């Protein structure tokens, strides 16, 4: 599957592709401002995932620091990146069908939208000012909205024990994007496209 990363943000990002236990494609790129990364991704790819990093360092071996969503401080992501992150996430060709969504479940970094850029479903999108309004005790002094869990590291918010409830800071991530998972048990905003359809994520899909 193709997926193109669009930054359409005025601000240079690190596009970061990965399954958690490798890279996907080149697995990272710096993407300035209006600038466009075409990656492949295999069929069958179950939990990747795609999210922007703000205020990168990258030494010439590719070796440094981002203020969202590092992951052990490389330029080519093999590991998710480090909260907060607004999350494109997809399990692909999986009886058929390829799972898209938005997720919050790890704060919120970049506004994004994720679309197929083929056709038979639609795309879901995260682009409210969730850093401008998120919660004092939220804010990640690097940049973004930290998810609860994340902050205060409890059974409820992190839903340790597979139970548990929305809470005043995932009602918080749900009222500005309801088309994003706020929580573990959020009732699920995935949508199913058909197997193999090509996506677009656009960070800064308005802005």
Same mark, same amino acid.
């Given at each position: 599957a193709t997926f193109e990363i669009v930054n359409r943000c005025s601000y240079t990002v690190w596009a970061a592709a990965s399954k958690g236990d490798a890279?996907?494609?080149?697995?990272?790129?710096?993407?300035?401002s209006g600038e466009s990364w075409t990656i492949n991704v295999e069929p069958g790819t179950n939990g990747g995932k795609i999210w922007a990093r703000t205020d990168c360092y990258f030494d010439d071996s590719?070796?440094?620091?981002?203020? !969202?969503?590092?992951?052990?401080? =490389? =330029? @080519?992501?093999?590991?998710?990146?480090?909260?907060? *992150? !607004?999350? /494109?996430? &997809?399990?692909?060709?999986?009886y058929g069908k390829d799972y898209i969504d938005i997720s919050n479940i790890k704060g919120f970094n970049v506004?994004?939208? %994720?679309?197929?850029? !083929?056709?038979?479903? @639609?795309? #879901?999108?995260? /682009?409210?000012?969730? #850093?401008?309004?998120?919660?004092?005790?939220?804010? /990640?002094?690097?940049?973004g909205c930290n998810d609860a869990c994340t902050v205060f590291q409890t059974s409820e918010y992190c839903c340790t024990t597979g139970k548990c409830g929305p809470?005043?800071?995932?009602? %918080? %991530?749900? @009222?500005?994007?309801?088309?994003? &998972?706020?929580? #573990?048990?959020?009732?699920?905003? *995935? #949508?199913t496209c058909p197997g193999s359809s090509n996506y677009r994520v656009t960070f800064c899909p308005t802005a």
């Open positions: 890279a996907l494609d080149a697995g990272g790129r710096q993407l300035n590719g070796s440094g620091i981002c203020k !969202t969503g590092d992951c052990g401080g =490389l =330029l @080519r992501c093999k590991r998710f990146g480090r909260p907060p *992150t !607004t999350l /494109a996430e &997809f399990s692909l060709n999986q506004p994004m939208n %994720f679309s197929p850029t !083929t056709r038979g479903c @639609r795309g #879901v999108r995260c /682009a409210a000012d969730i #850093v401008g309004q998120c919660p004092a005790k939220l804010k /990640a002094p690097g940049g809470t005043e800071y995932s009602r %918080f %991530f749900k @009222r500005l994007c309801p088309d994003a &998972f706020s929580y #573990v048990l959020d009732k699920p905003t *995935t #949508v």
